[PDB]
Each structure stands twice: as C-alpha cells, then as structure tokens.
Amino acid sequence: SLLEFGKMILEETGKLAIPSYSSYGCYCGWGGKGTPKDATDRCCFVHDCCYGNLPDCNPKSDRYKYKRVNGAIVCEKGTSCENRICECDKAAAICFRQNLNTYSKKYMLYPDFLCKGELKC
Ligand SMILES: COc1c(O)ccc2c1cc([N+](=O)[O-])c1c(C(=O)O)cc3c(c12)OCO3
C-alpha cells in the first residue's frame, strides 16, 4: 500500500513521499497521461506500468512487509501479490533516488491538464 511505498521513498530519497512525489510531473500521483516530464516522472510512469500488470492484485491498498539487508531493500516472501507489489515499489523508490540529481522543483504541483495523450507501456 501507499504506507509501505511511502516508507521506502523516505528511506531511499530522504524526502517525505508526500508531497515530494505525490504531485510531481504527469505520472507521480493519481494521473497517468502524456509524456513524462523527466527521469523522475519516468520512474512513476514505469511504476504505473508495473502496477498495471498486477490485475489480480490491489497495489495501492494491499499491505505487505519488507526489510533491509546490507543497506538494500529486501521484499519479504509473502503472497504472490504482496511480493510483486513490493518489487514494483522497490524499483520505483530506487529509481527516485538514482535520479535525485535532476529532480526539479518546477514539476511539483504540476497541473494534470498539461498532461494529455495515452503513452503505451
Ligand atoms: C498508481 O500510482 C502512483 C505512482 O506511479 C507513483 C507514486 C504514487 C502513485 C499513486 C498515489 N495515489 O494517489 O495514487 C500516490 C500517493 C497517494 O495516494 O497519496 C502518494 C505518494 C505517491 C503516489 O508517491 C509518493 O507519495
């Protein structure tokens, strides 16, 4: 759920998931349209694609557990859904920190209306 994902984000980036990544660009948030604004936005686009490929699960609401070994996130082996959701979240949180050097304040609170057109995964 957003609880676990938000925790990963804070641990990896040092930024509170909300509002740093909840209204960023075209894909970091509820929205999902247009061309990703930058690397960080692409992390969210990919994250959406990952969630979109878990039709048999409830990514935003399903709770799961994970731990950290040797400084890296390790998804606990729970149900198939919990494991997959965890992996989608892990990849995104890491993607966020790997791209913090191009994170731009101007894309925060980005207006959804500026994002149009479906972009295939
Ligand atoms: C399905 O999509 C999304 C992504 O691809 C990437 C990130 C988020 C996302 C959807 C969220 N909501 O809203 O859907 C959400 C939320 C929220 O619930 O408040 C809070 C956050 C997020 C996201 O990142 C940091 O803090």
Structure's resolution in angstroms: 1.7
Domains of the chain: 1-121 (1.20.90.10)
Q: Please tell me if the CB atom of residue 51 comes closer than 6 angstroms to any atom of ligand 1.
A: yes
Instruction: Tally the C-alpha atoms within 13 A of residue 17's C-alpha that lie toward its C-beta.
Output: 19
d(CA 4, CA 85): 10
For the chain, the maximum distance between any two Cα atoms, rounded to a whole number of angstroms, is: 42
To the question of whether residue 110 is assigned a binding role by annotation, the answer is: no
Per-residue HEC secondary structure of the chain comes to: CHHHHHHHHHHHHCCCHHHHCCCECCCECCCCCCCCCCHHHHHHHHHHHHHHCCCCCCCCCCCCCEEEECCEEEECCCCHHHHHHHHHHHHHHHHHHHCHHHCCHHHCCCCHHHCCCCCCC
Distance (Å) of CA 83 to CA 11, 99, 121: 19, 24, 21
Measured by CA distance, the residue closest to atom 11 of ligand 1 is: 29
Pocket test for ligand 1, best of 5, 96, 115 (most atoms within 8 A of CB): 5
The DSSP bridge pattern shows strands 72-75 and 66-69 to be: antiparallel
Active site residue 100: no
